[PDB]
Design a protein around this nucleic acid. Sequence first.
RNA 1: GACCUUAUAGCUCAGUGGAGAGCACGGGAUUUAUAAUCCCGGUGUCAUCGGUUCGAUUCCGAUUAAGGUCACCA
RNA 2: UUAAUA
RNA 3: GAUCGCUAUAAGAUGCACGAGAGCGAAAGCAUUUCACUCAACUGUGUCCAUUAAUCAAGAACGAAAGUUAGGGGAUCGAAGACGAUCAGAUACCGUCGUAGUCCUAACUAUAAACGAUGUCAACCAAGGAUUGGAUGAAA
Lengths: 212, 95, 133, 90
Amino acid sequence: EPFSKKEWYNVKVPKNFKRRTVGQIVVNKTAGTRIASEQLKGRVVEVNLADLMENEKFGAYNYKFKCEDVNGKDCLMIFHGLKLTTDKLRSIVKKWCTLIETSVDVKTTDGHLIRIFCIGFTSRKSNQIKKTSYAKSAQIKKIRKIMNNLITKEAASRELTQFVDYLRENKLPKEIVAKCSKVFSMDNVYIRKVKILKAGKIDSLKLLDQHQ
Amino acid sequence: TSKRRNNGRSKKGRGHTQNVRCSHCGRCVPKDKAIKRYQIKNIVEAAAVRDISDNSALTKYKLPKTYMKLEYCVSCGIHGRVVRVRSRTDRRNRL
Amino acid sequence: EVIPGSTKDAFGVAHIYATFNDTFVHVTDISGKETIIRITGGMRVKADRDESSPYAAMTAAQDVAKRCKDLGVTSLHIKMRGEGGVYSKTPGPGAQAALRALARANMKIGRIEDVTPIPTDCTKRKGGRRGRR
Amino acid sequence: RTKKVGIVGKYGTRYGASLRKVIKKIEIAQHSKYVCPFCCKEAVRRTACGIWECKGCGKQIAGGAYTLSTISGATVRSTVRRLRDAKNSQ
RNA sequence: GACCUUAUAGCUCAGUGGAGAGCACGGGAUUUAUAAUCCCGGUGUCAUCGGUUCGAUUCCGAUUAAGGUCACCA
RNA sequence: UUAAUA
RNA sequence: GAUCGCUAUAAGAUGCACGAGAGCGAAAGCAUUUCACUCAACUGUGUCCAUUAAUCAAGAACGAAAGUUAGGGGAUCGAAGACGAUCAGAUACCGUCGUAGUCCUAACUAUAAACGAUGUCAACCAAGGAUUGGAUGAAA
């Protein structure tokens, strides 16, 4: 029997989310020199945002977490990254517009080095009659420069935990559209992916503050 | 001689365009000469959409679709009935 | 009594990967590193031309569900996928049949997704300039 | 004087057309004068394998076997400058 | 010359103490007709003599053909 | 899947 | 211990969707975003010169891909080659593996259905709608 040596651990996300438990993961029982709590020190868990916040309006994003230490049958997950759902990313790429992309390496105030990817699209106006809405190379560079600089200021002041919660608020995509509409009519602005280029140092006290 | 004024392409004051690979036979065709079609379909067929809904774990989950762009060579587009052979006078219609 | 290793009703994720030559139904835990049961369409047939048949896909899907509920996994997440590296991104005919068979086996499907790997940019495709003939 | 055999006419007719071609490119570059990086004069001549001396400037420079600065020796110098600036700035 | 091996249908091979394969050939079918394809059939002195042989095409000698190796120091 | 010739 | 699943790696190559009868270039050709160095053209002009122009045997630059020479790299694909099918045969189409090559640097080669099969310059020339980039009024 394969599952005779298997035991399940409860998965606990940090307190920033409405839902605290997201599921159970499996691991073989302890052995000679194979400690189960050691073999769970790097597992990565992909969780939708809709489940975390218990609202289906947040279903466009997928979040990722990493098990750092075992608190007696419990992992204490930490935020590993985020990524747009595949169906949403391909549904926002219209044809007769201009696609604008960017990426910034931002050093969060608490020491995390992260890479943030932003995507945007030129839109059609209310009275517009012509089929195509393209932007010159000059307007595109202005727009990318605006969203490069504006996203850096928002993420450089706040630490990683609060910045991710700041992403849940639609202020940044709304601010970018409002600021970039002075250069060209923009409608769709999303932050499609965030990585962790260099993990900032963390302490068991810091994890405790992040877990109740 | 010239069956088409545009030679069957979409080429103009360019004069070299990159290749794209056919979706069926894997042939190399130029980007403008390729027969481009767009597909937007749900990942659940119309038979199983009811069956998926009945035993689900989400209250108001909206079924996502799949979007992909298919490019066919002339040989692999005519055989697959993507485009048909038209009349001599009906060839000129671009609608 | 309880099968060892089983637990209360939990969440699993089913990796349905059906090409035009076979079909894979493969459920893993939430982390994805531990696999509960992995059945392919080629284990439920005799000849080599029926491994992609819809019947082989549902037969492999029912056996996955029977083991999953018996092992405590009662609800699943679906990750549909085809051979889409540089080849046809359309999933095979058995992928839909396997997904429908999981539902009809009284399983609570969660979030469905298409995870066929779309290249940002591709390596050279098999066949040559003139392609399959 | 000669149609095409410029500097390798001293080898006569006794080493092979290909080998006399390869040695020609090296022997031209080995005997030519280079621009001297400290005084901007065409006055650097080779004195030994890897040692170059600015004739009208009084400097001895270490370089390639036959050319004053090698292609690999120039990219390395550029690479270190990029690394040093990055290290010096944060 | 001396040692060794082989000899089976019209052609290449199998197998033999109580003769298969293929290709070829003949007849029938398919085709407008041939080729291909399908169906059926007829083909071996087991190289020529003696002996053991219950009984030899097989085992043992002989006569032939066919090849392979050797034929050196002077 | 295969499909030569007059 | 394959196919499959998650996680980490380090090189090669490529540059999806946007991407179009749209743009640039003498043609060949050019698609990740930034910073430099250049270049050309259009529009605007009560700015300067004053025929400096057009086309051009000989002559000279650039010239896809393949190919050659010498280094580096060598992931994917793959003339040759080797298997397995199909066939009467199959040295082919189909499948598997796979050397040169495909990639970068230096130097040769100088040919393509290098096509708009339409030489370069200039004048006149029937109705439209739309589009790329300027100028100029109205409409925020």
